[PDB]
């Protein structure tokens with residue numbers, strides 16, 4: 020829905036959110052190429068509670084496996100990390116103090 | 118004319134020499150292209166894709182680039 | 195017309211890639 | 226008026242005295 | 257002096273490398289902080305070699321130059337110049353460093369033109385006098401009609417915070433900076449605004465507290481919240497007094513008399529606390545430490561006891577509650593007590609702080625800075641300190657000028673108009689003074705990525721025929737009116753940028769010999 | 780002095796290929812200034828020998844032979860005039876001997 | 887290198903090769919008016935660009951199919 024240079028950065032913001040399911044699928048011994056691809060197919064249909072099932076070794080329901088994460092954990096992980104990376108591209112000059 | 122003692126970057130020196138020995142015009146562009154194929158393979162490496170599976174995917178992709186480049190070609194010398 | 199040309203011949207285009215490559219090594223360490 | 230001012234901020238005003246003082250030591254050696 | 261050198265380990269240079277090392281060392285200082293000038297300039301990260309390096313990112317030009325430690329002798333004059341600019345007005349330390357370096361860069365262009373350096377000093381003194389009249393005649397005063405003065409104060413804080421890390425927080429941090437000085441209602445002491453930095457949360461979660469925050473929580477068995485209390489603070493010793501008689505011992509004959517003395521010592525410590533509660537108070541703040549024997553007396557009477565807040569902590573509590581220090585308790589009718597509504601304890605970042613909610617005569621504030629990292633909190637504290645110091649002097653001097661490159665083109669126009677009414681000996685030095693004043697909107701325009709060769713040319717054509725309020729619009733990248741956009745700066749800030757850079761460039765240009773002595777412990 | 784003015788175009792953010800393309804058009808216009816102002820000399824050889832002494836008088840003015848233009852100009856013009864052909868620049872053998880002033884030198 | 891933006895220029899040229907049949911559409915420094923490489927006479931050999939893609943692919947395959955480095959330390 021955006022245009023200009025803003026549309027190329029939200030896609031870079033959205034592609035960086037797929038790293039944590041790629042991290043969870045790679046550490047579980049699953050194939051991370053087909054796991055994150057299947058996760059985008061389940062959430063496009065309407066499955067908002069779909070994720071990586073480390074017990075079955077695939078994609079299943081999360082609330083059936085009783086995996087509950089608080090909202091303040093995930094909101095502050097997105098708010099503090101975005102505020103940090105908004106400063107590193109602004110703070111860039113190496114000055115070695117004597 | 119560099120003093121690069123790095124065995125991966127030494128292969129980029131022999132790549133520019135091999136373009137000079139065969140054709141001799143695109144010695145600069147063959148290093149930027151080889152660095153571009155390896156830069157795009159860095160993000161694919163973090164997704165768990167096998168490096169030979171990327172190399173097998175580049176051969177099926179470069180085969181399309183050879184056949185498509187032979188569409189419009191004519192000279193009357 | 196090209197409507198201008200902004201020549202940027204300065205340092206911090208290379209240091210900006212150094213902060214990116216250093217933070218990628220930390221994320222891959224605890225991956 | 227002063228009819229101009231010629232500022233000469235350069236080296237060889239001091240090296241010109243070095244060639245003078247070196248040649249005076251030669252003339253005083255065989256004096 | 258180089259020929260037949262009569263020095264041990266010291267070296268010198270006269271008129272060849274003296275002005276060469278002075279112009280190299282001063283331009284490299286100005287070219288260092290050149291990238292930090294303007295609303296789109298980047299920031300620096302300062303690091304050491306090791307041994308508790310303590311990295312401190314700063315965008316202000318004074319904090320960069322005070323930590324680098326330049327070995328050049330002439331570069332230390334520009335470092336000390338930006339230190340006075342931070343201590344006097346608190347802003348323009350980066351603008352005074354680039355302006356003093358662009359004067360010496362134009363003076364380096366007068367090396368090959370064989371201009372006498374005393375002619376450039378006499379040419380710049382007449383150029384600085386013409387530039388003082390440009391800012392004084394264009395200053396906008398504000399007396400009555402206070403609804404336009406509070407709107408003018410938000411343009412001062414909006415201009416200062418735009419060149420810092422608080423870029424997309426001007427809807428919040430402008431209100432945190434204007435209302436902090438507006439709650440002072442008097443002199444700009446610049447210490448009643450206690451800034452507390454806590455990790456966790458974004459910069460949008462930061463706020464200005466309506467009361468006051470403190471540490472060193474309330475006792476052991478004392479109440480944590482008292483509604484409608486009378487706050488009495490103190491600066492006296494509670495226990496282990498050893499009261500002011502050096503050389504006094506307890507020389508008794510038996511150990512039964514020692515038990516009578518130590519009971520008499522605790523009775524006088526109990527009688528001192530009994531003189532405090534005759535005022536009818538509920539809270540007690542002592543600058544010194546409170547030991548266990550008076551702490552039990554305040555807990556039995558239902559009185560709070562805040563022990564060892566700070567040396568300057570009782571000063572802010574005296575300005576936010578409306579009381580006095582009251583270090584002696586012998587006249588309850590001559591001791592004025594504080595006033596509050598709630599002394600409940602709040603938790604900010606897993607740390608319990610004493611919140612003095614609902615205080616009367618609150619001429620003190622508490623800014624609760626919350627950031628993602630410690631590097632952001634150290635930058636946002638210096639960014640807020642560069643904004644509160646200008647508003648503390650804008651309420652003392654209400655004269656404001658139009659910033660954003662508009663003030664520099666007004667100063668450069670008055671020099672160029674008087675450069676044509678002068679003979680050719682000093683007119684070339686005055687034209688170099690006007691070109692350095694036009695470099696300050698050129699650094700701002702080129703830091704965003706705009707066409708700096710055309711925007712300053714459009715500013716020079718605008719100010720040549722009218723348009724006294726025309727400046728640089730960094731939002732869209734064009735030329736707009738500064739009175740409409742609301743980009744104004746203080747008169748005393750812009751005067752100290754012009755005056756201190758003209759005096760510092762006068763010192764370095766008059767140097768023809770740099771005789772440095774032999775240093776100690778350097779081999 | 781071209782690269783000193785090119786150092787002034789560093790802070791103006793001018794692209795360096797624009798300075799190269801700007802100087803190629805500038806050098807092409809500068810060739811037409813010297814070509815249209817060149818003075819030729821064919822016949823009337825009494826004005827060409829006077830023109831040759833102005834060439835040697837300008838070259839020797841920027842050297843150590845300052846107050847010797849009444850002698851060293853005739854030593855340089857008549858040396859090439861006695862060649863009467865190609866400028867081989869080896870038939871003019873210069874012999875350097877100590878003793879005497881520069882006015883004592885001769886052809 | 888010409889002073890333009892890489893996104894604002896590559897998106898416009900690539901979109902014009904899909905709306906019509908794909909022409910000789912590139913870029914230039916002074917841009918010569920239009921972006922048609924057939925009118926600007928920017929002609930390169932077929933076997934030159936054929937060996938640019940073929941040699942860079944095989945050199946990438948020999949530096950992707952390697953998982954060990956056995957270099958020594960100091961010289962002596």
Ligand SMILES: Nc1ncnc2c1ncn2[C@@H]1O[C@H](COP(=O)(O)OP(=O)(O)O)[C@@H](O)[C@H]1O
Pocket residue numbers: 141142143144145146147912913914915926928
């Ligand atoms: N007039 C022009 N307009 C647009 N592009 C051009 C023009 N002239 C040359 N180029 C581009 O510049 C590039 C130069 O490549 P080059 O460095 O010569 O390759 P190699 O190093 O193999 O000789 C070519 O790929 C070509 O596409």
Ligand SMILES: Nc1ncnc2c1ncn2[C@@H]1O[C@H](COP(=O)(O)OP(=O)(O)O)[C@@H](O)[C@H]1O
Pocket residue numbers: 292293294295316317318341346347348349350351352414415416418419642659660661700728729730743
């Ligand atoms: N909104 C704006 N529009 C135009 N110019 C601005 C704006 N905000 C800030 N500036 C300019 O940015 C400059 C920042 O200078 P600064 O680095 O704060 O100086 P100092 O270090 O002395 O405080 C100011 O001179 C001001 O003219």
Ligand SMILES: [Mg+2]
Pocket residue numbers: 347348415416419642
């Ligand atoms: Mg400022």
Ligand SMILES: [Mg+2]
Pocket residue numbers: 837838841
């Ligand atoms: Mg000559």
